Design an enzyme around this catalytic site. Structure first.
Site, short mmCIF file in Angstrom:
data_model
loop_
_atom_site.label_atom_id
_atom_site.label_comp_id
_atom_site.label_asym_id
_atom_site.label_seq_id
_atom_site.Cartn_x
_atom_site.Cartn_y
_atom_site.Cartn_z
CD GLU A 159 -3.07 -1.02 2.19
OE1 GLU A 159 -2.85 -0.36 3.22
OE2 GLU A 159 -4.17 -1.56 1.96
CD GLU A 173 -4.28 -5.74 2.93
OE1 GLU A 173 -5.08 -4.92 3.42
OE2 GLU A 173 -3.05 -5.65 3.09
#
Ligand SMILES: *[C@@H]1O[C@H](CO)[C@@H](O[C@@H]2O[C@H](CO)[C@@H](O[C@@H]3O[C@H](CO[C@H]4O[C@H](CO[C@@H]5O[C@H](CO)[C@@H](O)[C@H](O)[C@@H]5O[C@H]5O[C@H](CO)[C@@H](O)[C@H](O)[C@@H]5O)[C@@H](O)[C@H](O[C@H]5O[C@H](CO)[C@@H](O)[C@H](O)[C@@H]5O[C@@H]5O[C@H](CO)[C@@H](O)[C@H](O)[C@@H]5O)[C@@H]4O)[C@@H](O)[C@H](O[C@@H]4O[C@H](CO)[C@@H](O)[C@H](O)[C@@H]4O[C@@H]4O[C@H](CO)[C@@H](O)[C@H](O)[C@@H]4O)[C@@H]3O)[C@H](O)[C@H]2NC(C)=O)[C@H](O)[C@H]1NC(C)=O
Ligand SMILES: *[C@@H]1O[C@H](CO)[C@@H](O[C@@H]2O[C@H](CO)[C@@H](O[C@@H]3O[C@H](CO[C@@H]4O[C@H](CO)[C@@H](O)[C@H](O)[C@@H]4O)[C@@H](O)[C@H](O[C@@H]4O[C@H](CO)[C@@H](O)[C@H](O)[C@@H]4O)[C@@H]3O)[C@H](O)[C@H]2NC(C)=O)[C@H](O)[C@H]1NC(C)=O
Length: 408
Positions: free
Chosen positions: A192, A294
């Site tokens: 991320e 995710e």
């Protein structure tokens, strides 16, 4: 090597995230942070990330507590359970500090690699594939507590990037060797990175591109690299490392949630489902292999400390950061206690989960965020399965083909 569009597993990726293990996250293991509370009335003295957890305790104390945590939070038993439940892969986050630390870093280092290797062994032992995920970079790539250092965004600063790059190369070299190729089918360059606030061009040319060069031309391995989408919109990476330019073995990792923004939390169950199904159809048109690294069953951001230590939840309008606020939508009372879940809420979560699974399985697969937590339900695969909110077997459907029946 692994062909994510035509995987040797004969089925899409169906994995779980080994979250909060080698990189601490307050909401996943709140007891480790609640241990610092000295006043039941305030959060004064409570570290907000692993960086400060180590800083506050000091090397010796941080090491002993971390060792107790690493040696118990996850053991081979967990991996056997994971395999018994149908999952075929585990994603393991690890911080750069496990391998190398900055001169002024408070982090405990040099002990996490042993556990990572043990977990890879447990995975092989149980016929599970693995993704080694570099989840934290020097100076932080996103300012999230899950990067190790909250509120810092110096990832691309030459000094830090040099360290993160050296660690990544160590990881690429070791886990791309012949002995790991069959089990480790992916190495995520960085989790991320906050694209919107970073210099995307510098990350590409100074971090991502060099990594591919090192792996394929220096190490000369066919290991697959996983590149997180940096929160960019779909198709953004289509023009990067294209097959036409001779690049191969590159997978884009898209994360998907509908709880970190008030407008998203305001969605009805039908809107939540429509958005989930579109997450799946939208990648079919993408120019790279893709896997949803995710996602969660969560439909609220109510879970304690999900928004980091010291912050409330947008869902019940208790969240405030600086001059930014939130507004009341619904209650967060007894959020993670199944005894207080209405039949409607159970149905909605089960539907939401099934829509997501169907969508992500349209291409590549999925990895649920969080196999286990100390007390969460929405972010805990084990508890979701026990309460019938997550499919067992994984192909079980109480609400089949929701993505094939949408219009109203
Ligand atoms: C499921 O997945 C799991 C995850 O992978 C997997 O787990 C693995 O299970 C196996 C099975 O139980 C474990 O192997 C046994 O490990 C026992 C303990 O060994 C460890 O300690 C040794 C010494 O302890 C200290 O070491 C440090 C570092 O060197 C020193 O600084 C300290 O001073 C200590 O050493 C002193 O004390 C010693 C004891 O008194 C003394 O001998 C020594 O001289 C010092 O005075 C340590 O050496 C060892 O590390 C490695 O040591 C050398 C290289 O440095 C090699 O022997 C190995 O590389 C060894 O690696 C370890 O063990 C295996 C390799 O065999 C490896 O896979 C592990 O990952 C681990 O790194 C350990 O840290 C051992 O006692 C036991 O030995 C047996 O001996 C029998 C008699 O000879 C044999 O018949 C057995 O086969 C077996 O192995 C033999 O001997 C050697 C083992 O040392 C082998 O090299 C040899 O080939 C032969 O087979 C086992 O090795 C393993 O630890 C564990 N790994 C993990 C990840 O946790 C599990 O197996 C999977 N299950 C399924 C279903 O598949
Ligand atoms: C069906 O699939 C096709 C592809 O086969 C899609 O068509 C286009 O495919 C392109 C693949 O190269 C996509 O390119 C990307 O476009 C991005 C820009 O898109 C938005 O732009 C606005 C305004 O600037 C921004 O606000 C948004 O955040 C988005 O970025 C680029 O960012 C991306 O990367 C670029 O690279 C160049 C060169 O290095 C840089 O100069 C640039 O700064 C940037 O980093 C890339 O070029 C393209 O997005 C996509 N079409 C669009 C716009 O959707 C179809 O879209 C697919 N069908 C649909 C809509 O589902």
């Amino acid at each position: 090597y692994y062909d994510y569009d035509h995987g040797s597993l004969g089925e899409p990726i169906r994995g779980v995230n080994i979250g909060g293990w080698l990189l601490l996250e307050p909401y996943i293991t709140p007891s480790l942070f609640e241990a610092f509370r000295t006043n039941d009335d305030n959060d004064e003295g409570i570290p907000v990330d692993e960086y400060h957890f180590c800083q506050y305790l000091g090397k010796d104390l941080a090491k002993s507590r971390l060792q107790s945590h690493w040696s118990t939070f996850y053991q081979e038993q967990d991996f056997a359970n994971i395999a018994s439940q149908g999952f075929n892969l585990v994603r393991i986050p690890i911080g750069y500090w496990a391998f190398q630390i900055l001169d002024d870093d408070p982090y405990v280092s040099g002990l996490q690699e042993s556990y990572l290797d043990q977990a890879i062994g447990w995975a092989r032992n149980n016929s599970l594939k693995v993704w080694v995920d570099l989840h934290g970079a020097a100076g932080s790539q996103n300012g999230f507590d899950n990067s190790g250092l909250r509120d810092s965004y110096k990832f691309l600063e030459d000094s830090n990037l040099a360290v993160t790059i050296n660690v990544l190369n160590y990881i690429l070299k070791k886990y791309s060797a012949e002995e790991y190729l069959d089990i480790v089918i992916g190495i995520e360059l960085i989790n991320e990175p906050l694209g919107p606030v970073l210099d995307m061009d510098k990350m590409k040319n100074d971090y991502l591109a060099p990594a591919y060069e090192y792996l394929r031309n220096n190490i000369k391995s066919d290991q697959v690299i996983i590149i997180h989408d940096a929160f960019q919109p779909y198709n953004y990476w289509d023009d990067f490392m294209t097959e036409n330019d001779g690049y191969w073995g590159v997978t884009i990792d898209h994360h998907h949630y509908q709880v970190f923004a008030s407008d998203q939390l305001e969605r009805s169950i039908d809107e939540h489902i429509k958005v989930a199904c579109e997450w799946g159809t939208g990648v079919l048109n993408e120019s790279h292999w893709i896997v949803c690294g995710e996602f969660a069953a969560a439909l609220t951001d109510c879970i304690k400390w999900l928004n980091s230590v010291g912050f409330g939840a947008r869902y019940d309008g208790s969240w405030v950061n600086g001059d930014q606020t939130s507004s009341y939508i619904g209650s967060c009372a007894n959020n993670d206690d199944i005894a207080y879940w209405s039949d409607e809420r159970k149905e909605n979560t089960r539907r939401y989960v099934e829509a997501q699974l169907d969508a992500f399985e349209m291409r590549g697969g999925w990895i649920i965020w969080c196999y286990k937590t100390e007390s969460s339900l929405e972010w805990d695969a084990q508890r979701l399965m026990f309460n019938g909110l997550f499919p067992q077997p994984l192909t079980d459907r109480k609400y089949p083909n929701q993505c094939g029946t949408i219009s109203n």
